[PDB]
Amino acid sequence: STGSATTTPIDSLDDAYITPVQIGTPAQTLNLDFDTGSSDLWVFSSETTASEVDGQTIYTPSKSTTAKLLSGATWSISYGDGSSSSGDVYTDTVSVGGLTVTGQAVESAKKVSSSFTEDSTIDGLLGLAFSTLNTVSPTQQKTFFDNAKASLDSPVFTADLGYHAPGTYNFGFIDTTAYTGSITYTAVSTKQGFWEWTSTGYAVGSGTFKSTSIDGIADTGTTLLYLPATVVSAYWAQVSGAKSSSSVGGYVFPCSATLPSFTFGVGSARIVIPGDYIDFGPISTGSSSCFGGIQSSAGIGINIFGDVALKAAFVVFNGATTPTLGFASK
């Protein structure tokens, strides 16, 4: 089997991407944030605290003839940005663009943090990292990809995020018309439960490529590109007026600037992020200072190849017995 679904940016800045997911019987369509950095499929629901729901589409398990409460199961997750959510669990039929999983764990939120409440476009998340990170207690649950894997024509999923435009998530196949050149595959460590790989280096604009190992995770659930301070300082030093602002919480630059591109290495291959992709608009409404798309990972503990980097590539999340990552220009 295969599955294919369109992913759409939630706003004019590509702050996040949403993909329609059918849950239950009859189908209840919710727009979830596909996240290769986490492993919980959680949704806003009829159980979510009323004051914490503001515009989101909810999952109502009582209206689904295939929903079953997973006895005694609870979940609670905290994301790297400080956001959190928790609740109870149901098993139900979940479909993504033609691909169906019966008995998928659908984590129903009873509580969500302010940032989720404030994002009316995100109805929940669909975790695509390794099932070792799933927070369901006392019995850990599998991801949608993990549950569908054996049925897929190929044990893979692909991420093809658009820049200010719709994109695609494919399951079980590689669309050879969606990229240029070839796909370069690289080794993955699953030790931290993430799609963790090692970039071979970088370049700033038309500058000399620096060969250096950058260990990081391929994370669709993170908006920006988080890299070592040395790297990020080398990037912003090419932008006149750019500075690291402690009050804003990162590198900012004059909105009138035309940004240089950023190239990252995948083996001997190169992925070029165009300069416009690193512009995240005014720091506050009407400000002439803009927020940068490349930020330091110094306070995180890990480098994050988020949407800024992934949307420049056709990305293969290879779930073969030894998982790997594939990147191609597009």
Task: Enter the DSSP assignment of 88.
Answer: E
- Considering only the stretches 77-85, 99-107, 183-191, 240-248, report the one whose residues sit in contact with ligand U1H under the rule CB under 6 A: 77-85
Q: Is 79 in the site for ligand U1H (CB under 6 A)?
A: yes
Map residue 318 onto helix, strand or coil. strand
Residues in CB range of 148: below 8 A, 6 or more apart: 1, 3, 99, 101, 171, 172
Q: Which is nearer to ligand U1H, 33 or 92 (CB)?
A: 33
Choose the binding region for ligand U1H from 34-42, 179-187, 224-232, 280-288 (rule: CB under 6 A).
34-42
16 binding ligand U1H? (CB under 6 A)? yes
Amino acid at 304: I
- One residue of 115, 140, 151, 233 binding ligand U1H per CB under 6 A: 115
Q: Tell me the window of 114-122, 146-154, 250-258, 289-297 that interacts with ligand U1H (CB under 6 A).
A: 114-122
By the rule CB under 6 A, 40 interacts with ligand U1H: no
Q: What DSSP letter does each residue of 142-201 carry, written as one string?
A: --HHHHHGGGSSSSEEEEE--SSS-EEEEES---TTSSSS-PEEEE-B-TTSS-EEEEEE
Examine residue 282 and say whether the peptide bond preceding it is cis (omega within 30 degrees of 0): no
As a whole number of angstroms, the distance between CA 216 and CA 194 comes to 9
35 is catalytic: yes
Q: What angle do CA 211, 212, 218 make, to 5 degrees?
A: 115
CA distance 19 to 223: 15
Residues 34, 116, 169, 179: which binds ligand U1H (CB under 6 A)?
A: 116
Residue 34 near ligand U1H by CB under 6 A: no
By rule CB under 6 A, what string of x and - marks binding of each residue 217-236 to ligand U1H?
A: ----xx--------------
Q: Does 119 bind ligand U1H (CB under 6 A)?
A: yes
Does 199 participate in catalysis according to the annotation?
yes
- Which of 162, 205 has the CB closer to ligand U1H? 162
Catalytic pick among 39, 95, 199, 261? 199
Q: Which is nearer to ligand U1H, 131 or 238 (CB)?
A: 131
- Name which of 81 and 175 has its Cβ closer to ligand U1H: 81
Amino acid at 176: T
> Is 107 a binder of ligand U1H (CB under 6 A)?
no
Distance CA 307, CA 88 (A): 30
Number of residues that bind ligand U1H (CB under 6 A): 15
| Interacting residue with ligand U1H among 7, 18, 22, 35 (CB under 6 A) | 35
Q: How far apart are the first and last CA of the chain?
A: 25
Helix (H, G, I), strand (E, B) or coil at 63: helix
Which residues participate in catalysis according to the annotation? 35, 199
| Sites of contact with ligand U1H (CB under 6 A) | 16, 33, 35, 37-38, 79, 81, 83, 115-116, 119, 122, 125, 221-222
